[PDB]
Amino acid sequence: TEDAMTVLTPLTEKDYEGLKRVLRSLQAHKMAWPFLEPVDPNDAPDYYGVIKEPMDLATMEERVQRRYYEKLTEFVADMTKIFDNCRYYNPSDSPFYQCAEVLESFFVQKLKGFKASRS
Ligand SMILES: Cn1ncc(N[C@H]2CCNC2)c(Cl)c1=O
């Protein structure tokens, strides 16, 4: 199943080309700009004291380029931190919270396509 594959099956070189495509799709999305680089503390009081595990798309790109991820779960966990951190720090009427909702929905669509392609 795709769930077990996601947790257990090591990422191959072919898998990594798919991860790069997924990442580039997210970076190009109209609602991705809040997530392209780390949050600046001057945009968000106490951000780094509140958020335990910050993440952003440039950090994920570096990690993809360095072959940091061994399993798809780990890549999904980093991506999900981006959206969960945003929704945790901000109120639901924040424009950043709204971007997280839209971009995660897009991620989920692309992720399902990638999982289907591994077979
Ligand atoms: C509270 N807060 N402040 C900023 C931000 N993104 C920044 C990154 C660079 N340009 C916008 C997010 Cl994602 C957030 O949640």
Side-chain angles (χ1 to χ4, degrees), residues 17-41:
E17 294 306 311
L19 290 185
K20 297 173 188 182
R21 179 182 52 76
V22 170
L23 188 57
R24 290 190 307 252
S25 277
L26 264 75
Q27 289 170 313
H29 193 284
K30 175 56 215 168
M31 317 274 304
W33 73 265
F35 313 112
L36 293 174
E37 297 286 333
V39 177
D40 193 295

Short mmCIF file of all heavy atoms in Angstrom, two decimals, residues 17-41:
data_model
loop_
_atom_site.label_atom_id
_atom_site.label_comp_id
_atom_site.label_asym_id
_atom_site.label_seq_id
_atom_site.Cartn_x
_atom_site.Cartn_y
_atom_site.Cartn_z
N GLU A 17 13.98 12.59 -8.07
CA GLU A 17 13.57 13.48 -9.16
C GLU A 17 12.11 13.89 -9.00
O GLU A 17 11.75 15.03 -9.29
CB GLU A 17 13.83 12.80 -10.50
CG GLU A 17 15.32 12.60 -10.78
CD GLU A 17 16.11 13.89 -10.65
OE1 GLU A 17 15.70 14.91 -11.25
OE2 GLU A 17 17.14 13.90 -9.94
N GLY A 18 11.26 12.97 -8.54
CA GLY A 18 9.88 13.34 -8.25
C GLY A 18 9.75 14.33 -7.10
O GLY A 18 8.92 15.24 -7.16
N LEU A 19 10.55 14.15 -6.05
CA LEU A 19 10.52 15.09 -4.93
C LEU A 19 10.93 16.49 -5.38
O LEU A 19 10.35 17.49 -4.94
CB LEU A 19 11.43 14.64 -3.80
CG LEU A 19 11.05 13.42 -2.97
CD1 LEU A 19 12.07 13.26 -1.86
CD2 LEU A 19 9.63 13.54 -2.42
N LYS A 20 11.94 16.57 -6.25
CA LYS A 20 12.34 17.87 -6.77
C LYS A 20 11.21 18.53 -7.54
O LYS A 20 10.96 19.73 -7.39
CB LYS A 20 13.58 17.73 -7.66
CG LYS A 20 14.82 17.22 -6.94
CD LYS A 20 15.93 16.96 -7.95
CE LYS A 20 17.12 16.28 -7.32
NZ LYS A 20 18.17 16.09 -8.36
N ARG A 21 10.50 17.75 -8.36
CA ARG A 21 9.36 18.29 -9.10
C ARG A 21 8.28 18.79 -8.16
O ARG A 21 7.71 19.87 -8.37
CB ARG A 21 8.77 17.23 -10.03
CG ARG A 21 7.56 17.74 -10.82
CD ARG A 21 6.95 16.67 -11.71
NE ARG A 21 6.66 15.44 -10.99
CZ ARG A 21 5.64 15.27 -10.15
NH1 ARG A 21 4.78 16.24 -9.90
NH2 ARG A 21 5.49 14.10 -9.54
N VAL A 22 7.96 18.01 -7.11
CA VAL A 22 6.95 18.43 -6.15
C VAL A 22 7.37 19.72 -5.47
O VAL A 22 6.58 20.67 -5.35
CB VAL A 22 6.65 17.31 -5.14
CG1 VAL A 22 5.78 17.85 -4.00
CG2 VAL A 22 5.93 16.18 -5.84
N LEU A 23 8.62 19.78 -5.02
CA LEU A 23 9.11 20.98 -4.35
C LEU A 23 9.05 22.21 -5.26
O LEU A 23 8.59 23.28 -4.84
CB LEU A 23 10.52 20.75 -3.83
CG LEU A 23 11.08 21.86 -2.96
CD1 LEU A 23 10.19 22.12 -1.76
CD2 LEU A 23 12.46 21.46 -2.52
N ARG A 24 9.51 22.07 -6.51
CA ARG A 24 9.47 23.19 -7.44
C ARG A 24 8.04 23.64 -7.71
O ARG A 24 7.77 24.84 -7.85
CB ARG A 24 10.18 22.84 -8.75
CG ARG A 24 11.70 22.70 -8.63
CD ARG A 24 12.35 22.59 -10.01
NE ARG A 24 11.71 21.54 -10.79
CZ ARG A 24 12.27 20.37 -11.09
NH1 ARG A 24 13.51 20.08 -10.72
NH2 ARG A 24 11.57 19.48 -11.77
N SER A 25 7.10 22.69 -7.76
CA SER A 25 5.69 23.07 -7.92
C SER A 25 5.22 23.92 -6.76
O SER A 25 4.50 24.91 -6.96
CB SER A 25 4.82 21.82 -8.04
OG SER A 25 4.81 21.35 -9.37
N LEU A 26 5.60 23.56 -5.53
CA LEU A 26 5.18 24.35 -4.38
C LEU A 26 5.83 25.73 -4.40
O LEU A 26 5.16 26.73 -4.15
CB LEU A 26 5.50 23.60 -3.09
CG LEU A 26 4.27 22.83 -2.59
CD1 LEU A 26 4.00 21.57 -3.41
CD2 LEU A 26 4.39 22.50 -1.12
N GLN A 27 7.11 25.79 -4.77
CA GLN A 27 7.81 27.07 -4.78
C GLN A 27 7.24 28.03 -5.81
O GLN A 27 7.31 29.25 -5.62
CB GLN A 27 9.31 26.85 -5.00
CG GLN A 27 10.00 26.22 -3.79
CD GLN A 27 11.40 25.79 -4.13
OE1 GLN A 27 11.63 25.17 -5.16
NE2 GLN A 27 12.34 26.15 -3.28
N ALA A 28 6.67 27.50 -6.89
CA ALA A 28 6.11 28.32 -7.96
C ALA A 28 4.67 28.74 -7.71
O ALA A 28 4.16 29.62 -8.42
CB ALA A 28 6.16 27.55 -9.28
N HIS A 29 4.00 28.16 -6.72
CA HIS A 29 2.59 28.44 -6.49
C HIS A 29 2.38 29.87 -6.01
O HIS A 29 3.19 30.41 -5.25
CB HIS A 29 2.06 27.45 -5.44
CG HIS A 29 0.56 27.41 -5.33
ND1 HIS A 29 -0.16 28.40 -4.69
CD2 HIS A 29 -0.34 26.49 -5.74
CE1 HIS A 29 -1.45 28.09 -4.74
NE2 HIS A 29 -1.58 26.94 -5.37
N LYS A 30 1.27 30.49 -6.43
CA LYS A 30 1.02 31.89 -6.11
C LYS A 30 0.95 32.14 -4.60
O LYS A 30 1.31 33.22 -4.13
CB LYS A 30 -0.27 32.37 -6.78
CG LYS A 30 -0.67 33.79 -6.41
CD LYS A 30 0.44 34.78 -6.70
CE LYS A 30 0.48 35.90 -5.66
NZ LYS A 30 1.73 36.70 -5.76
N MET A 31 0.51 31.15 -3.83
CA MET A 31 0.36 31.30 -2.39
C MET A 31 1.57 30.81 -1.62
O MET A 31 1.51 30.69 -0.39
CB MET A 31 -0.90 30.56 -1.92
CG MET A 31 -2.11 30.76 -2.81
SD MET A 31 -3.04 32.24 -2.40
CE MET A 31 -3.38 31.96 -0.67
N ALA A 32 2.68 30.52 -2.29
CA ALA A 32 3.84 29.98 -1.59
C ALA A 32 4.78 31.04 -1.04
O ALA A 32 5.65 30.70 -0.23
CB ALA A 32 4.63 29.03 -2.49
N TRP A 33 4.65 32.30 -1.45
CA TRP A 33 5.68 33.26 -1.06
C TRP A 33 5.91 33.40 0.44
O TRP A 33 7.07 33.62 0.82
CB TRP A 33 5.50 34.62 -1.76
CG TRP A 33 4.37 35.42 -1.27
CD1 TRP A 33 3.11 35.48 -1.79
CD2 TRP A 33 4.36 36.29 -0.13
NE1 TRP A 33 2.33 36.33 -1.06
CE2 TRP A 33 3.07 36.85 -0.03
CE3 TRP A 33 5.33 36.67 0.81
CZ2 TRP A 33 2.72 37.75 0.96
CZ3 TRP A 33 4.98 37.56 1.80
CH2 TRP A 33 3.69 38.10 1.87
N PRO A 34 4.92 33.25 1.33
CA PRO A 34 5.25 33.33 2.76
C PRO A 34 6.18 32.23 3.22
O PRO A 34 6.77 32.37 4.30
CB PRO A 34 3.89 33.22 3.46
CG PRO A 34 2.90 33.67 2.43
CD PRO A 34 3.45 33.18 1.13
N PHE A 35 6.32 31.15 2.46
CA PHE A 35 7.03 29.97 2.92
C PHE A 35 8.35 29.74 2.19
O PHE A 35 9.03 28.76 2.46
CB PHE A 35 6.12 28.74 2.80
CG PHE A 35 4.74 28.98 3.36
CD1 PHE A 35 3.62 29.02 2.54
CD2 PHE A 35 4.58 29.21 4.71
CE1 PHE A 35 2.35 29.26 3.07
CE2 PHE A 35 3.33 29.45 5.25
CZ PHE A 35 2.21 29.47 4.42
N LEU A 36 8.74 30.66 1.31
CA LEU A 36 9.94 30.44 0.51
C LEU A 36 11.21 30.51 1.34
O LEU A 36 12.19 29.82 1.02
CB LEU A 36 10.00 31.44 -0.64
CG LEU A 36 8.93 31.30 -1.72
CD1 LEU A 36 9.04 32.45 -2.70
CD2 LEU A 36 9.01 29.94 -2.44
N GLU A 37 11.24 31.34 2.38
CA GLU A 37 12.43 31.56 3.19
C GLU A 37 11.99 31.56 4.64
O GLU A 37 10.79 31.67 4.91
CB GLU A 37 13.07 32.91 2.82
CG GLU A 37 13.56 32.99 1.38
CD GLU A 37 14.83 32.20 1.16
OE1 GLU A 37 15.58 32.02 2.14
OE2 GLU A 37 15.07 31.75 0.02
N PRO A 38 12.90 31.45 5.61
CA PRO A 38 12.49 31.43 7.02
C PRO A 38 11.75 32.70 7.44
O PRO A 38 11.98 33.79 6.91
CB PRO A 38 13.82 31.30 7.77
CG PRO A 38 14.73 30.64 6.80
CD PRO A 38 14.34 31.17 5.45
N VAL A 39 10.89 32.54 8.44
CA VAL A 39 10.23 33.69 9.06
C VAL A 39 11.27 34.62 9.68
O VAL A 39 12.16 34.17 10.42
CB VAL A 39 9.22 33.20 10.11
CG1 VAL A 39 8.58 34.37 10.84
CG2 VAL A 39 8.16 32.30 9.46
N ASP A 40 11.16 35.91 9.37
CA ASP A 40 12.02 36.90 10.02
C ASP A 40 11.42 37.25 11.37
O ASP A 40 10.21 37.51 11.45
CB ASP A 40 12.12 38.16 9.16
CG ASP A 40 13.25 39.08 9.61
OD1 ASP A 40 13.20 39.64 10.73
OD2 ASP A 40 14.21 39.26 8.83
N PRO A 41 12.21 37.27 12.44
CA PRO A 41 11.65 37.65 13.75
C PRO A 41 10.97 39.01 13.75
O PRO A 41 10.06 39.23 14.56
CB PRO A 41 12.89 37.63 14.67
CG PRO A 41 14.04 37.80 13.74
CD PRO A 41 13.66 37.05 12.50
#
